[PDB]
């Protein structure tokens, strides 16, 4: 049905079923040096997120114009510190924070970002980028600025010798490598009824009773992750992710950056057993939503000794302790084993996973081992 942009891109066609593994087109051995042309009156600006004024401009763009949840009651609320965590992992490059501004006023009307990541896709491990935070101001919508943003970040990533990318979207584009669903678990139902995040089925008081949790976790030895846990968390994660077909491959520095706890950004808890050994961990990140609503998002949960269902029940208890109103998790990895048992309900809409310039068979949600922010 005619994707005018995506039909020119090195991606599989929709409905074409891929039994091969590999690049769609050859690597470019000479790359366009000039930026692509924006519509009249707009210009590229690389955003330095170390400048507090510029970082404020970006989260103002994103808080007003970014992904809205399905029924448009709520939009994500991004703190500066959350953006620094997500946009400056190890290896971040300044040209990959790619802004669009009005020429005359220098107002920030658009953004797209790339961060480097090593991606394990089936039997191949390849250095790639993760594309995130594509955003166009509500007043600039449907002007074909998004294809220019995408071509321009592609060129900038090509200049660094990286020809593959991974990204997610809620829309269907050619062609998903995997499709996931959102599930939500009510922590503070009373507050969720007011914003109309939820509704009563049947009584206010038995809903609270249905969703009530213990005040402290069940698992012995659960404690926040510390610096001395970085190597074992790294080793548990790498071994755990081998069972999935699409996963990140993290160095120990990346493990520190993604999992080391930062208040109101990311929490990690390890299970240290009676021997002093760390056998398990759970993690979730913080993303509030504006009308605020404090939501937790399952990140990476690794179990060796503790059963997965016990780990996630403890995660729910910890999130509630910290004042989260809701706990969100995708149906990927092993999550379908605890989702219904722990009283998650299913959300609206799909998260589709994609590869750029890598053709490969699609996979079931349970084989997707990658969580983005
Ligand atoms: C080797 C390195 C490669 C690196 C690049 C890898 C590829 C990365 C690709 C980007 C990864 C994004 C990862 C994330 O961050 S996903 C989150 C995307 N952000 C939002 O949804 C925030 C709110 N919405 C917006 O800001 C705008 O609606 C956006 C910017 C999404 C589109 O702006 P607009 O509404 O004004 O439309 P247009 O006239 O300018 O252009 C319309 C074109 O956009 C296609 N479209 C719509 N939505 C998406 C989407 N989420 N991914 C890819 N394509 C998308 C559409 O099919 C059409 O093309 P085609 O149908 O004619 O063919």
Curated annotation (Swiss-Prot):
Keywords: Acyltransferase, Cytoplasm, Membrane, Phosphoprotein, Transferase. The keyword Membrane applies. Its EC number is 2.3.1.97, 2.3.1.-. Changing residue 66 to P: Abolished glycine- and lysine-myristoyltransferase activities. The keyword Nucleotide-binding does not apply. Coiled coil: none annotated. Heart, gut, kidney, liver and placenta. It catalyses: N-terminal glycyl-[protein] + tetradecanoyl-CoA = N-tetradecanoylglycyl-[protein] + CoA + H(+); N-terminal glycyl-L-lysyl-[protein] + tetradecanoyl-CoA = N-terminal glycyl-(N(6)-tetradecanoyl)-L-lysyl-[protein] + CoA + H(+). GO terms for molecular function: glycylpeptide N-tetradecanoyltransferase activity; myristoyltransferase activity; peptidyl-lysine N6-myristoyltransferase activity. GO terms for biological process: in utero embryonic development; ketone metabolic process; N-terminal peptidyl-glycine N-myristoylation; positive regulation of establishment of protein localization to mitochondrion; protein localization to membrane; regulation of opsin-mediated signaling pathway. It comes from the Eukaryota. GO terms for cellular component: cytoplasm; cytosol; plasma membrane. It is a peripheral membrane protein. Changing residue 369 to D/K: Reduced activity. It is found in: Cytoplasm; Cytoplasm, Cytosol; Membrane. Tetradecanoyl-CoA binds at residues 4-6, 133-136, 142, 144-146. Belongs to the NMT family. Adds a myristoyl group to the N-terminal glycine residue of certain cellular and viral proteins. Also able to mediate N-terminal lysine myristoylation of proteins: catalyzes myristoylation of ARF6 on both 'Gly-2' and 'Lys-3'. Lysine myristoylation is required to maintain ARF6 on membranes during the GTPase cycle. This is Glycylpeptide N-tetradecanoyltransferase 1. It comes from Homo sapiens. The gene is NMT1. The chain holds residues 115 to 496 of 496 of the full protein.
């Amino acid at each position: 049905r005619s994707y005018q942009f995506w039909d020119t891109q090195p991606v599989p066609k929709l409905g074409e079923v891929v039994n091969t593994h590999g690049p769609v087109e050859p690597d470019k051995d000479n790359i366009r040096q000039e930026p692509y042309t924006l519509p009249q009156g707009f210009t590229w600006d690389a955003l330095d997120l170390g400048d507090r004024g510029v970082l404020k401009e970006l989260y103002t763009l994103l808080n007003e114009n970014y992904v809205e949840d399905d029924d448009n009651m709520f939009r994500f609320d991004y703190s500066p510190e959350f953006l620094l965590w997500a946009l400056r992992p190890p290896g971040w490059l300044p040209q990959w924070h790619c802004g669009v501004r009005v020429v005359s006023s220098r107002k920030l009307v658009g953004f797209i970002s790339a961060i480097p990541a090593n991606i394990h896709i089936y039997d191949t491990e390849k250095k790639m980028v993760e594309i995130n935070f594509l955003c166009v101001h509500k007043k600039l919508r449907s002007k074909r600025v998004a294809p220019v943003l995408i071509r321009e970040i592609t060129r900038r990533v090509h200049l660094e010798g990286i020809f593959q990318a991974v990204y997610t979207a809620g829309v269907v584009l050619p062609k998903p490598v995997g499709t996931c669903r959102y599930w939500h678990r009510s922590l503070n139902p009373r507050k969720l009824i007011e914003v109309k995040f939820s509704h009563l089925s049947m009584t206010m008081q038995r809903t609270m009773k249905l969703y009530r949790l213990p005040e402290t976790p069940k698992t012995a030895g659960l404690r926040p992750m510390e610096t001395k846990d970085i190597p074992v968390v790294h080793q548990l994660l790498t071994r755990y992710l081998k069972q999935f077909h699409l996963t990140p491959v993290m160095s120990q520095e990346e493990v520190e950056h993604w999992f080391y706890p930062q208040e109101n950004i990311i929490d990690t808890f390890v299970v240290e057993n009676a021997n002093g050994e760390v056998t398990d961990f759970l993690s979730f990140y913080t993303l509030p939503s504006t009308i605020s609503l404090k939501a937790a998002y399952s990140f990476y949960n690794v179990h060796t000794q503790t059963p997965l269902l016990d780990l996630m029940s403890d995660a729910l208890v910890l999130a509630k302790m910290k004042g989260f109103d809701v706990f969100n998790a995708l149906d990927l990895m092993e999550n379908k084993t605890f989702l219904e048992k722990l009283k998650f309900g299913i959300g609206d809409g799909n998260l589709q996973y994609y590869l750029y310039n890598w053709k490969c068979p699609s996979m079931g949600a349970e084989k997707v081992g990658l969580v983005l922010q």
